[PDB]
């Protein structure tokens, strides 16, 4: 054995936030820096900041008091079925105070108008779009921060993010105290996870594409098409807070997690995402819920490894509406139109890393994963699995 | 026996399933439903679906009766989830009658409906005994049969055009005929030969011989009804036991070795073409199925041509050649007389009588020199050896 080091302490904890609301980091922008906490999104790739007033945002970038502000002259509008923002783009010195020494500048989207994007207590002024240039609004000729940062600094084209859920509410003040997990710029930190990191294709670069060979539940073969899991695509997105479907994966998915889970009903609202169910204080019966292997396609040819979840990951603590004392959660899995998305919720059971340089994601079992007596989250590996190419979609 | 009123009311093609109207509710929600005597069950689409353009809306109809129940039927080849319940069904170009039968909603589905096959439902015409849940949901014909007059017995005349029928022909086309109830004497020629029906699940049947171009496949009978030899409307190709499909393809390739196909063609995976007008029938085989008959140690045989079991298929250039796929694949589940055989005869499920009856279709494409058969009969001993256990 040998005990595995942490190298990059002075960016370990820099993460605040939760599943639902978003995990952030502080960032700068302009001269002098001005602070705001920032959305860490994977699945988009625009560096986004509130820049006029708004109900839920106690601060935003002011570009009149920023002498290092460059105006692009160019307007851009970023809707989503969830949430959409208007913005004006522009360039400025951007630094991040618990990430690298190097302060570079970027492209930033001053948001002046929004609609269901900004959330109110989540305490965040912006959004970090990880992601790559592909997907860039509004269109891929606007560099990306990470672009950025890598092209004007010695920083190691590589990102690690470790979200770390709590396993139960965080009231606001709570949120606020709570250390959220860490984003390493540049490397790996070892004190983050435990076992082995195993790394899958980066398939594409535009979102963070991954391809998902087959599917586990307690250990059943879900025995479904491994093109039907990947249609129209998987990505890690850590701005999304469920680990989201294919329809008909969803469907298989729920049947087979509610057949395991039989010992007790559930209403289907609950399975709808919608509604939370409630345990007496401590009693939640994690036991009697299964656990979820997704494999993934691994280095090697004819090679895969597989990442398993418990019910603690895909469970979403939530407070009761009566502040009870029960122990409530939320059903954090859900169906997608777009493909599967590896959300918040799974990557709350692992340390990730995002190698871009050498193309490829990695996974290790967190060292912040909530879990219990009997069972933990796992990376194991590796599988002997045949013609996983063919478990790719294309149009 | 005539009943104009049912003669030419299907739709469809071997491909993608022949179809009936039928209007479910009150009032009457018209839908087009698969016709399949290869399950018991009546299941409609109740749910949006990309493939569908309609369908079963229990919230509009007066008469529907929740069973409380749910059934999760999944197959190889497509697999459906349904929410149990009754109401009032009707065949337009059928009985004049109108009967409460079982009806599963179908909810969520897995490859079960097919892209621009016009139909939202399927009609099990099978027996109870493969009726799921189980076989206390009474099969629609089942309801039909006890609640009417109707005599307990349908007939099937699937017709096969010969060549490739796009969107829009597809739907002017009269794919057929599902007689209720009868027997219609203008949709056949020759005798009608009757086969027992074995056993009372799937309409089952047993072969005792089997001919490529008279030459005996020579196989034990019971190699060719194992484990079970159906007929199933549902069903694009004849499908045969796995040992049974290697024997015939390897004599049917024999037969026609004077033009080399690619392996993906025997697989009944890609397409054949060949100048317009110039498909080399002649080098092709026919086929000859021998049935045991009703008499004691006597059999009768139905022939099918390639016409039967090549089929049409549009070139991916949708040129002007003529193209088809090698309809004749294997099966781990036993022979099935799928579509594209029943397209050769006029098929009479004789329910009543327990047998079905085969008699050369008046629709069966064929050429100047060969044309399908029904003929007997034959002297066959021990038939009843040739049946699985
Ligand atoms: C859980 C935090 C909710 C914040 O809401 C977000 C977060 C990210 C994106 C970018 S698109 C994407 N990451 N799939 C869009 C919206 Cl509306
Ligand atoms: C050619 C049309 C294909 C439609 O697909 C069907 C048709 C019938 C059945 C019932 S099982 C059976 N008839 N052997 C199941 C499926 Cl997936």
Same mark, same amino acid.
């Given at each position: 054995?040998?005990?595995?080091?942490?190298?990059?302490?002075?960016?370990?904890?820099?993460?605040?936030?939760?599943?639902?609301?978003?995990? +952030?980091?502080?960032?700068?922008?302009?001269?002098?820096?001005?602070?705001?906490?920032?959305?860490?999104?994977?699945?988009?790739?625009?560096?986004?900041?509130?820049?006029?007033?708004?109900?839920?945002?106690?601060?935003?970038?002011?570009?009149?008091?920023?002498?290092?502000?460059?105006?692009?002259?160019?307007?851009?509008?970023?809707?989503?079925?969830?949430?959409?923002?208007?913005?004006?783009?522009?360039?400025?010195?951007?630094?991040?105070?618990?990430?690298?020494?190097?302060?570079?500048?970027?492209?930033?989207?001053?948001?002046?108008?929004?609609?269901?994007?900004?959330?109110?207590?989540?305490?965040?002024?912006?959004?970090?779009?990880?992601?790559?240039?592909?997907?860039?609004?509004?269109?891929?000729?606007?560099?990306?921060?990470?672009?950025?940062?890598?092209?004007?600094?010695?920083?190691?084209?590589?990102?690690?993010?470790?979200?770390?859920?709590?396993?139960?509410?965080?009231?606001? *003040?709570?949120?606020?105290?709570?250390?959220?997990?860490?984003?390493?710029?540049?490397?790996?930190?070892? *004190?983050?996870?435990?076992?082995?990191?195993?790394?899958?294709?980066?398939?594409?670069?535009?979102? +963070?594409?991954?391809?998902?060979?087959?599917?586990?539940?307690?250990?059943?073969?879900?025995?479904?098409?491994?093109?039907?899991?990947?249609?129209?695509?998987?990505?890690?997105?850590?701005?999304?807070?469920?680990?989201?479907?294919?329809?008909?994966?969803?469907?298989?998915?729920?049947?087979?997690?509610?057949?395991? *889970?039989?010992?007790?009903?559930?209403?289907?609202?609950?399975?709808?995402?919608?509604?939370?169910?409630?345990?007496?204080?401590?009693?939640?019966?994690?036991?009697?819920?299964?656990?979820?292997?997704?494999?993934?396609?691994?280095?090697?040819?004819?090679?895969?490894?597989?990442?398993?979840?418990?019910?603690?990951?895909?469970?979403?603590?939530?407070?009761?509406?009566?502040?009870?004392?029960?122990?409530?959660?939320?059903?954090?899995?859900?169906?997608?139109?777009?493909?599967?998305?590896?959300?918040?919720?799974?990557?709350?059971?692992?340390?990730?890393?995002?190698?871009?340089?050498?193309?490829?994601?990695?996974?290790?079992?967190?060292?912040?994963?909530?879990?219990?007596?009997?069972?933990?989250?796992?990376?194991?590996?590796?599988?002997?699995?045949?013609?996983?190419?063919?478990?790719? +979609?294309?149009?």
């Amino acid at each position: 054995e040998p005990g595995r080091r942490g190298s990059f302490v002075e960016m370990v904890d820099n993460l605040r936030g939760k599943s639902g609301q978003g995990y +952030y980091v502080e960032m700068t922008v302009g001269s002098p820096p001005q602070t705001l906490n920032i959305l860490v999104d994977t699945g988009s790739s625009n560096f986004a900041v509130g820049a006029a007033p708004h109900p839920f945002l106690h601060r935003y970038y002011q570009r009149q008091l920023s002498s290092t502000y460059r105006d692009l002259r160019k307007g851009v509008y970023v809707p989503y079925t969830q949430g959409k923002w208007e913005g004006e783009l522009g360039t400025d010195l951007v630094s991040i105070p618990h990430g690298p020494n190097v302060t570079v500048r970027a492209n930033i989207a001053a948001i002046t108008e929004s609609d269901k994007f900004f959330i109110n207590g989540s305490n965040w002024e912006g959004i970090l779009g990880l992601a790559y240039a592909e997907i860039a609004r509004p269109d891929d000729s606007l560099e990306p921060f990470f672009d950025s940062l890598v092209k004007q600094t010695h920083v190691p084209n590589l990102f690690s993010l470790q979200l770390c859920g709590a396993g139960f509410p965080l009231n606001q *003040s709570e949120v606020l105290a709570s250390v959220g997990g860490s984003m390493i710029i540049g490397g790996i930190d070892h *004190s983050l996870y435990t076992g082995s990191l195993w790394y899958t294709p980066i398939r594409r670069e535009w979102y +963070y594409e991954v391809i998902i060979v087959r599917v586990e539940i307690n250990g059943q073969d879900l025995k479904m098409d491994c093109k039907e899991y990947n249609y129209d695509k998987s990505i890690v997105d850590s701005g999304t807070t469920n680990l989201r479907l294919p329809k008909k994966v969803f469907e298989a998915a729920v049947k087979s997690i509610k057949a395991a *889970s039989s010992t007790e009903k559930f209403p289907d609202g609950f399975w709808l995402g919608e509604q939370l169910v409630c345990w007496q204080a401590g009693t939640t019966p994690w036991n009697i819920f299964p656990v979820i292997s997704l494999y993934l396609m691994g280095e090697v040819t004819n090679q895969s490894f597989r990442i398993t979840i418990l019910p603690q990951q895909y469970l979403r603590p939530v407070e009761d509406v009566a502040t009870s004392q029960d122990d409530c959660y939320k059903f954090a899995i859900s169906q997608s139109s777009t493909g599967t998305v590896m959300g918040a919720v799974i990557m709350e059971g692992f340390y990730v890393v995002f190698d871009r340089a050498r193309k490829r994601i990695g996974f290790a079992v967190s060292a912040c994963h909530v879990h219990d007596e009997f069972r933990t989250a796992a990376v194991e590996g590796p599988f002997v699995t045949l013609d996983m190419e063919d478990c790719g +979609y294309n149009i």
